[PDB]
Ligand binder design. Structure first.
Ligand code: CLA
Ligand code: CLA
Ligand code: CLA
Ligand code: CLA
Ligand code: CLA
Ligand code: CLA
Ligand code: CLA
Ligand code: CLA
Ligand SMILES: CCCCCCCCCCCCCCCCCC(=O)OC[C@H](COP(=O)(O)O)OC(=O)CCCCCCCCCCCCCCCCC
Ligand SMILES: CC1=C(/C=C/C(C)=C/C=C/C(C)=C/C=C/C=C(C)/C=C/C=C(C)/C=C/C2=C(C)CCCC2(C)C)C(C)(C)CCC1
Ligand code: SF4
Ligand code: SF4
Ligand code: SF4
Lengths: 41, 35, 143, 731, 74, 165, 74, 31, 80
């Protein structure tokens, strides 16, 4: 376990995981708030 | 134009005679060994 | 003192089947090299011009074109065979030099009695500036 | 083996390298054996004389060919319906159809149609017949002979000038500012007033009768009485017909501004007055420096007093006079920078403010002249930076230049390089990102999601010039403002009339596409400058090679040690920056050509909507306009555009060849050539022939030069073919 | 894993059963995209009352040559 | 209007573009039973397009000679014309988020530099520490201005290595 | 690349097409036999001509192929 | 009125003279 | 005919002389370092320019330094 979590902290896996999380977040934001051209508040 | 014959003589001179002669002279000079 | 050995021309050559990488016209106009060694057993070695030859018992002689081929062959011998050889330079008029084991001792070991040619006693940036040596037919690192 | 007479090191080379390097080092006099400063300066001076002889012979040849084989007399009568002829074609490989297809502008045989705009220039400056062109050609031929004789004369020890004569900078500046610039433009004004102006109003003024013609009806009395305004009495009417006397006028020094209505060019009296003002200003400027008459300036003292207190600049400009004066590469870099920027100025003004009659009317000439001068300027800028790098490697003395602005700018080079890197990274990231975003949202059929920033700063500046299209109503666009009230009686009528009309190129309307393209141009300039500046500053030594100045300006590498040091010299920085200069000038010329190709067809919309995404550039510009060009020759025959189609493919071939030298490197080629040498020394009937020079593969730096030369020549030829065949085909 | 993906996409997100009946006019497809940023346009009007990307891997012809004729077998 | 650009809610070309794009999607609809999955997808697409065109008209974006929204990149000439959401507000938003990520990374570097094996803590990230610093990075304007007014943000060039001129 | 260019042009010019009850009407019309003899023939009758379907693909289902075509150029 | 043949020939002869001056200057530079 | 120089930062580690493939560098007695040996380049006529000597020196900056110059048959490495 400790070594498995160390493996999950490696740059190859953590980078890929973070890119996946940020990509998913942008995809969700664009799915619910689409076609937003300006910061209309 | 005037002197219609003149290009027919000058063009071969500059594109054939002059290049061959210049290249021969240049190749003789760069290999002249003692200038 | 040390006395470089004499090139014995009548020496057996390695068993080799002929190659297309041997001498060329440069060995008849400029100069070529000869390497001589002594083999403790008849064994297969890799001639630097492609292919494999067999070195025979006792003295062996082999002539190449460039010095660097001879030294590559000698490095092969020193590493994989522990055999020590001598490299002579043959001119086509008959003159023979003696090259690599110049002082009998190999270049990596201090011989005490060697010439310290081309040894500046300054660092690398302690050389002169090119503007100061302008129009001199030399480079900053030989002043 | 004695060809490189100037280099003993290369003479003893047993290989073919001795030839190659023996050519490429023939003009680097400072590197020649046994070379003194005196001899260097004298050889340079004579070489300059040879260069001017070349220039005069080239212009004389242009004049002679137009006079002999050109249709100048015919072109004068119908300047808009006649295609100007360059020179005749005599080629014995032509088929009959090609001879048919190249007989164009009325000439008896095949001819080339001129795209240099020399017809318009000679027509504007007063030349009307072919006898005048022939007289100019003969005069210029004699002048070139005279300059050649002077160049030989000053190589002689009886006439060889001393080295201290060359370094005399104050006298040289006095004479170039006052004499080469001032009096030359004064005499040009004299020609304009005495010849070009009267020849523009139907009157013939020549060598025969110029002493019997008054340029002004009350000649020379207003000039010497101060009544100078009498020389601008009645200008050219708005219905004036060029070359004729239909509403001509008598004013010789007018200041109307704007354009001639018929020629769509600058008024000729405007240019005469221009050159008069320039002459006066430049003569005054030429009386600034001190020679032998006890008045004037010592430039050294000026430089020594430009040191700000508080020491923000350090020692100020202490030691810059000697630095510039002693180094010829510093002077060459300064001159190259100035000349290149002025070439860009010439290109950018001559299209918006065309100075020659019936220029801008002809469209291929406009594009050709603009692209020509833009490419010339780009190359000259690369050369200016290359010679700055050479100055740093060769002629820079830290001890003399200690604490001055040169040392201070070498001190913090990392700030400069890092900030150029940031600016270029920002511009590239963002311009590419906006282009890709527009391109993707267009690809998904929703062009309304495009990020279309408006160039409000450039639109605002356009509005400041009197362009009442964006409603800024700012400076000259406000008929009530102070600059507007000041110029409304001098220059502003014609200027505003020209600027507010969409019939010319004077201040084109700009939208989001112009914004994106200008930022692409900014990316190109910043990255090219990054490469050049970095290679100039990082030339005396890096962290990777702390003793680089010990090796010179050009060298291959520093072996494969320390990770590898390919392309480490400053020459390789110039090499890498030439590619970026080519790319940037290509962007500039693409932008200009598409903008004006939309302009000339009346279809501004094609550009204004299709230029915000890259597929618009690929499809609506490169692909669409290439239809006539690639159809020049085809299985159904050929037309006049066959030469341009062949040149198009020829440039493609040259560029593709240059990749061979750019990608493959010396090491495959050496073994290959060496196997070939074995093959030749070793084959019957050919052993009877042997090489005098040992054939060796091109050196590393030489191969980089060869690949770069092929790249540049192919780039230039391909774009020139496309431009000429895409503009002359449609217009 | 790659083959399983191919067969699963043929079974679920493909017009294979519709393409079997009229193999001459229905354009083979086996990949549909989501709505997320206007990329829905990529769903071609291939045929069979279906919308998706037009595959070119020749899997439909392969499956027909094998003799499938059902989406349960995929 | 800020520079010859009428509001898209007024521009006729903008509404014409809306019309044409919707008409294209209708032509695509007229091939499926209006209850099949392709028909539902097309109807959803048309609804999305109509919503976008109404949203753009509501927010008062500027359309040009063509029917395409334009943006203003000058504060002041966009703040006195009600167009600050075009470039200025997203400028603030970006600058903030970019600074957040940059400050989090910078502080992580400065935190793992003073450890046993700093070259090891870059290829094997310490996720709890990275996450803590990622949370602290949200106040980056405050902390960064504090470090600038303190002089601890930057390093004096007498300590940064340089090249031999 | 040259092999696949040869295959594409030869098949589109001398094999692929539609039968119109009186003869085969190939996609390009047989121009390989007369135009492939020259480099300009390849640049004009195969590479400029047949690229019309990729650069004009925006707003269609093939729009993705219009992007990659550009993107690969990058 | 096109230029006559003798004008062409005079021009070509003067060009030859100018070429002679050019070769003199070139050999001076090579020295 | 490349110019090979050895500077006093040398520590006499013998790496540069084992690296060279053409026997240009050599060990000589010295006293300005702990090993009491320095390198020397007597046979510089044989230098090809490979810079294997310069890629093996551990000193910072490098003690053995090669300056490629005039080219001959030996320097250009020609077997034909
Ligand atoms: C330097 C400018 C220049 C250029 C680029 C050309 C170019 C050309 N000329 Mg021309 N020529 C020139 C000057 C020039 N000329 C001048 C000043 C005259 C007045 C005497 C002539 C008189 C002339 C005639 C009578 C003819 C040409 C012809 C031609 C064409 C064929 C070349 C040829 O074989 O003729 C040969 C050219 C000459 C014998 C004299 C030209 C000498 C120039 C000044 C050379 C200058 C050298 C140059 C500046 C440096 C380049 C380096 C080089 C030496 C390696 C060609 C397009 C022929 C033609 O019409 O083809 C259809 C033709 O019959 N020219
Ligand atoms: C350097 C160029 C130049 C030259 C060579 C000439 C030559 C001539 N001009 Mg002219 N002119 C020029 C420029 C020039 N002009 C300019 C720039 C303008 C105004 C835009 C005029 C306007 C003009 C008018 C209106 C008239 C002439 C006339 C004449 C002719 C009568 C001589 C004369 O003017 O009386 C003699 C001159 C003087 C008594 C005093 C002049 C001395 C000046 C002020 C100082 C000289 C210094 C000067 C910088 C030297 C430059 C060197 C350079 C010439 C090589 C003559 C052949 C007259 C004519 O008869 O037409 C044929 C005539 O009426 N000119
Ligand atoms: C007033 C302009 C000017 C002057 C006087 C000089 C003068 C000099 N330069 Mg320089 N330079 C200039 C502009 C100038 N340059 C510009 C604009 C550039 C940018 C391209 C350069 C870039 C440059 C570099 C990188 C170097 C020099 C160097 C030198 C010095 C030696 C030149 C040499 O080696 O000759 C040799 C001349 C050649 C080898 C000509 C090469 C062939 C050309 C480039 C291409 C030929 C292809 C041809 C056009 C194709 C035909 C077309 C047709 C087929 C379609 C010399 C003092 C060298 C130096 O100082 O050494 C440290 C050096 O390395 N220059
Ligand atoms: C299309 C070809 C191309 C491209 C895109 C570039 C791009 C760039 N060059 Mg370059 N160059 C080129 C050709 C090219 N060059 C050629 C042929 C030469 C001659 C050898 C040079 C020589 C050259 C030099 C000498 C220099 C540059 C520099 C630069 C950088 C300038 C900064 C910038 O603009 O930021 C913009 C950044 C981009 C445009 C890159 C795009 C960002 C990517 C696409 C986003 C990533 C998306 C995704 C995650 C990608 C990964 C996916 C994948 C792994 C699955 C930039 C990245 C300069 C530099 O180093 O900058 C400091 C530098 O000095 N170039
Ligand atoms: C269009 C660009 C181009 C061109 C023309 C070439 C050409 C060539 N390459 Mg090359 N190559 C290129 C790009 C190019 N390459 C690139 C980008 C790379 C990087 C990967 C390489 C990498 C590469 C390697 C590794 C090798 C080659 C080799 C060769 C040669 C093979 C012999 C041959 O093809 O027969 C004949 C040559 C031609 C058909 C060239 C065209 C010449 C025309 C058709 C005829 C010549 C007559 C001429 C027109 C008349 C003279 C005019 C007069 C004024 C002089 C040949 C000269 C190989 C080689 O050296 O030989 C085996 C070699 O191994 N290339
Ligand atoms: C050649 C291998 C391969 C490839 C390239 C794809 C590619 C794709 N599949 Mg997929 N699939 C495959 C094998 C493959 N599959 C296999 C073997 C199975 C059997 C279980 C499936 C079952 C499957 C289903 C049920 C679905 C897809 C879907 C998709 C599409 C969306 C993928 C996505 O966004 O996931 C999301 C990205 C993630 C990181 C989530 C991953 C978490 C999953 C649930 C567990 C795997 C870890 C995509 C084009 C979806 C689709 O068709 O869209 C319409 C869909 O619903 N696939
Ligand atoms: C970064 C470059 C830049 C540029 C090119 C401009 C340009 C402009 N600004 Mg501006 N501005 C900028 C940055 C810039 N700004 C920044 C960073 C801010 C925030 C501090 C502002 C805040 C601002 C305001 C509040 C106003 C302008 C205004 C203007 C316009 C009138 C300028 C003038 O009257 O004479 C220039 C005077 C000088 C001293 C120079 C002009 C187009 C005015 C405007 O909107 O006009 C309609 C206006 O009131 N700007
Ligand atoms: C947190 C790390 C970090 C930080 C604070 C900086 C900061 C800076 N960089 Mg830099 N950079 C980084 C990482 C970082 N960089 C990495 C990984 C690379 C390799 C691609 C680069 C490559 C790079 C170049 C080439 C340049 C800079 C430049 C600059 C300066 C200009 C600002 C800028 O826009 O840069 C631009 C930022 C990038 C080009 C890429 C950013 C990389 C990602 C987005 C950030 C990494 C975050 C990290 C992986 C996450 C850790 C979080 C933690 C919880 C674990 C600036 C001080 C420029 C300069 O010279 O200064 C004027 C410059 O030209 N950087
Ligand atoms: C799913 C994998 C999740 C693994 C969770 C952490 C595993 C740590 C562990 O098992 O200790 C190694 C464990 C010993 O524990 P340790 O001494 O702490 O390393 O080694 C084993 O005895 C078996 C290792 C196999 C671990 C399961 C592999 C995945 C099984 C499912 C196959 C699919
Ligand atoms: C590397 C090097 C070098 C070279 C350099 C260079 C090449 C530089 C440059 C550069 C450049 C090429 C620049 C440019 C410039 C310009 C400018 C900067 C300007 C300006 C202007 C202005 C400011 C304007 C104003 C105005 C306006 C606004 C408009 C109207 C008019 C007026 C005038 C008012 C040298 C050797 C020297 C040194 C060392 C090294
Ligand atoms: S690959 Fe060539 S340029 Fe690079 S280090 Fe080796 S020899 Fe030098
Ligand atoms: S490798 Fe460097 S430090 Fe070692 S002996 Fe050679 S020159 Fe001296
Ligand atoms: S460059 Fe190569 S041949 Fe020359 S001294 Fe160094 S290791 Fe020996």
């Amino acid at each position: 376990m400790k070594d498995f979590t160390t493996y999950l902290s490696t740059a190859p896996v953590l980078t890929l995981l973070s890119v996946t999380v940020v990509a998913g977040l942008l995809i969700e934001i664009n799915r619910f708030f689409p076609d937003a051209l300006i910061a209309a508040f | 134009m005037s002197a219609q014959f003149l290009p027919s003589i000058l063009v071969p001179l500059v594109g054939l005679v002059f290049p061959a002669v210049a290249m021969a002279s240049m190749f003789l000079y760069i290999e002249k060994e003692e200038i | 003192a040390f006395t470089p050995p004499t090139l014995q021309s009548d020496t057996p050559s390695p068993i080799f089947g002929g190659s297309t990488g041997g001498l060329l016209s440069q060995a008849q106009v400029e100069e070529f090299h000869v390497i001589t060694w002594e083999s403790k057993k008849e064994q297969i070695f890799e001639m630097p011009t492609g292919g494999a030859a067999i070195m025979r018992q006792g003295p062996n002689l082999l002539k190449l074109a460039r010095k660097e081929q001879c030294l590559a062959l000698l490095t092969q011998l020193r590493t994989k065979f522990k055999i020590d050889g001598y490299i002579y330079r043959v001119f086509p008029n008959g003159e023979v030099q003696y090259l690599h084991p110049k002082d009998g001792v190999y270049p990596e070991k201090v011989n005490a009695g060697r010439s310290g040619d081309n040894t500046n006693m300054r660092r690398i940036g302690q050389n002169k500036e090119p503007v100061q040596i302008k129009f001199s037919g030399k480079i900053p690192a030989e002043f | 083996k004695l060809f490189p007479k100037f280099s003993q090191a290369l003479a003893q080379d047993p290989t073919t390298r001795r030839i190659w390097f023996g050519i490429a080092t023939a003009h680097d006099f400072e590197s020649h054996d046994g070379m003194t400063e005196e001899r260097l300066y004298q050889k340079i001076f004579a070489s300059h004389f040879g260069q001017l002889a070349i220039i005069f012979l080239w212009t004389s040849g242009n004049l002679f060919h137009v006079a002999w084989q050109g249709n100048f007399e015919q072109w004068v009568q119908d300047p808009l319906h006649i295609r100007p002829i360059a020179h005749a074609i005599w080629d014995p490989h032509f088929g009959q159809p090609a001879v048919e297809a190249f007989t164009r502008g009325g000439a008896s045989g095949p001819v080339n149609i001129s795209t240099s705009g020399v017809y318009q220039w000679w027509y504007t400056i007063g030349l009307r017949t072919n006898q005048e062109l022939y007289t100019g050609s003969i005069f210029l031929l004699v002048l070139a002979a005279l300059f050649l004789f002077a160049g030989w004369l000053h190589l002689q020890p009886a006439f060889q000038p001393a080295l201290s004569w060359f370094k005399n900078a104050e006298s040289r500046l006095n004479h170039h500012l006052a004499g080469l610039f001032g009096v030359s433009s004064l005499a040009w004004t004299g020609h304009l007033v005495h010849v070009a102006i009267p020849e523009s109003r139907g009157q013939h003024v020549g060598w025969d009768n110029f002493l019997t013609v008054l340029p002004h009806p009350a000649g020379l009395t207003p000039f010497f009485t101060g009544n100078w305004a009498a020389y601008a009495e009645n200008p050219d009417s708005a219905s004036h017909v060029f070359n004729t006397a239909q509403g001509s006028g008598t004013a010789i020094l007018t200041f109307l501004g704007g354009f001639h209505p018929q020629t769509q060019s600058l008024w000729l009296t405007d240019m005469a007055h221009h050159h008069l003002a320039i002459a006066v200003i430049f003569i005054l400027a030429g009386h600034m420096y001190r020679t032998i008459f006890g008045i004037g300036h010592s430039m050294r003292e000026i430089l020594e007093a430009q040191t700000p207190p508080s020491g923000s600049l350090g020692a100020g400009h202490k030691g810059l006079y000697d630095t510039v004066n002693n180094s010829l590469h510093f002077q060459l870099g300064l001159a190259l920078a100035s000349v290149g920027t002025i070439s860009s100025l010439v290109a950018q003004h001559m299209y918006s403010l065309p100075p020659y009659a019936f220029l801008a009317q002809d469209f291929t000439t406009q594009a050709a002249l603009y692209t020509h001068h833009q490419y010339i300027a780009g190359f000259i800028m690369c050369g200016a930076f290359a010679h700055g790098a050479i100055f740093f490697v060769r002629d820079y003395d830290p001890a003399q230049n200690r604490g001055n602005v040169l040392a201070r700018i070498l001190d913090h080079k990392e700030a400069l390089i890092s900030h150029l890197s940031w600016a270029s990274l920002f511009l590239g990231f963002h311009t590419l990102g906006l282009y890709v975003h527009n391109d993707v949202v267009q690809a998904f059929g929703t062009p309304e999601k495009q990020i279309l920033i408006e160039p409000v700063f450039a639109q605002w500046i356009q509005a400041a010039h009197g362009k009442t299209a964006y409603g800024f109503d700012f400076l000259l666009s406000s008929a009530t403002s102070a600059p507007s009230l000041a110029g409304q009686a001098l220059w502003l009528p014609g200027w505003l009339q020209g600027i507010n009309s969409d019939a010319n190129s004077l201040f084109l309307t700009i939208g989001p596409g112009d914004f994106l393209v200008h930022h692409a141009i900014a990316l190109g300039l910043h990255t090219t400058t990054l490469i050049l500046v970095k290679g100039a500053l990082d030339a005396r030594g890096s962290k990777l090679m702390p003793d680089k100045k010990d090796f010179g300006y050009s060298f291959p590498c520093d072996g494969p040690g320390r990770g590898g040091t390919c392309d480490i010299s400053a020459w390789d920085a110039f090499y890498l920056a030439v590619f970026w200069m080519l790319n940037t000038i290509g962007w500039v010329t693409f932008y200009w050509h598409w903008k004006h190709l939309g302009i000339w067809q009346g279809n501004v919309n094609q550009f204004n909507e299709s230029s915000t995404y890259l597929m618009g550039w690929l499809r609506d510009y490169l692909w669409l306009n290439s239809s006539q060009l690639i159809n020049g020759y085809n299985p159904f025959g050929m037309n006049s555009l066959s030469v341009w189609a062949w040149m198009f493919l020829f440039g493609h071939l040259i560029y593709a060849t240059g990749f061979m030298f750019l990608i493959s490197w010396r090491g495959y080629w050496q073994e290959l050539i060496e196997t070939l040498a074995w093959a030749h020394e070793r084959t019957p009937l050919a052993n009877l022939v042997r090489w005098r020079d040992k054939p060796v593969a091109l050196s590393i730096v030489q191969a980089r030069l060869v690949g770069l030369t092929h790249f540049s020549v192919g780039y230039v030829l391909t774009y020139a073919a496309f431009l000429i065949a895409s503009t002359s085909g449609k217009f | 894993i790659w083959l399983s993906g191919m067969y699963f996409h043929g079974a679920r997100f493909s017009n294979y059963e519709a393409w079997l009946t009229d193999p001459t006019h229905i354009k083979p497809s086996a990949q549909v995209v989501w709505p997320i940023v206007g990329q829905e346009i990529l769903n071609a009007d291939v045929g069979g009352g279906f919308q998706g990307l037009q595959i070119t891997s020749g899997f439909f012809q392969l499956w027909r040559a094998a003799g499938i004729t059902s989406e349960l077998q995929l | 209007d800020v520079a010859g650009l009428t509001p898209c809610s007024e521009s006729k070309a903008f509404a014409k573009r809306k019309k044409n794009e919707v008409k294209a999607l209708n032509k695509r609809l007229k091939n499926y039973e209006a209850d099949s999955a392709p028909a539902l997808a097309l109807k959803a697409t048309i609804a999305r397009t109509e919503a976008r065109f109404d949203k753009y008209a509501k927010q008062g974006l500027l359309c040009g000679t063509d029917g395409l929204p334009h943006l203003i990149a000058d504060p002041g000439l966009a703040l006195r014309y009600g167009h600050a959401g075009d470039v200025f507000i997203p400028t603030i938003g970006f600058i903030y988020f970019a600074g957040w990520l940059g400050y989090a990374g910078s502080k992580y570097l400065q935190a793992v530099a003073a450890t046993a094996k700093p070259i090891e803590k870059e290829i094997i990230i310490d996720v709890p520490l990275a996450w803590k610093l990622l949370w602290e990075g949200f106040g980056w304007p405050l902390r960064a201005f504090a470090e600038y007014k303190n002089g601890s943000l930057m390093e004096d060039d007498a300590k940064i290595t340089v090249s031999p001129r | 690349s040259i092999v696949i260019f040869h295959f594409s042009w030869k098949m589109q010019s001398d094999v692929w097409g539609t039968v119109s009850a009186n003869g085969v009407s190939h996609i390009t019309g047989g121009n390989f036999a007369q135009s492939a003899n020259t480099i300009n023939g390849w640049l004009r009758d195969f590479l400029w001509a047949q690229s019309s379907q990729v650069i004009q693909s925006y707003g269609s289902a093939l729009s993705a192929y219009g992007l990659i075509f550009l993107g690969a150029h990058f | 009125m096109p230029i006559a043949d003798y004008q062409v020939f005079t021009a070509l002869f003067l060009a030859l003279a100018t070429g002679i001056f050019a070769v003199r200057l070139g050999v001076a530079l090579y020295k | 005919s490349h110019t090979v120089k050895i500077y006093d930062t040398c520590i006499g580690c013998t790496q540069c002389v084992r690296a060279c493939p053409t026997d240009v560098l050599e060990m000589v007695p010295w006293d300005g370092c702990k090993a009491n040996q320095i390198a020397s380049a007597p046979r510089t006529e044989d230098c090809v320019g490979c810079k294997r000597c310069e890629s093996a020196c551990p000193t910072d900056f490098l003690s053995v330094r090669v300056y490629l110059g005039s080219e001959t048959t030996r320097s250009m490495g020609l077997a034909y």
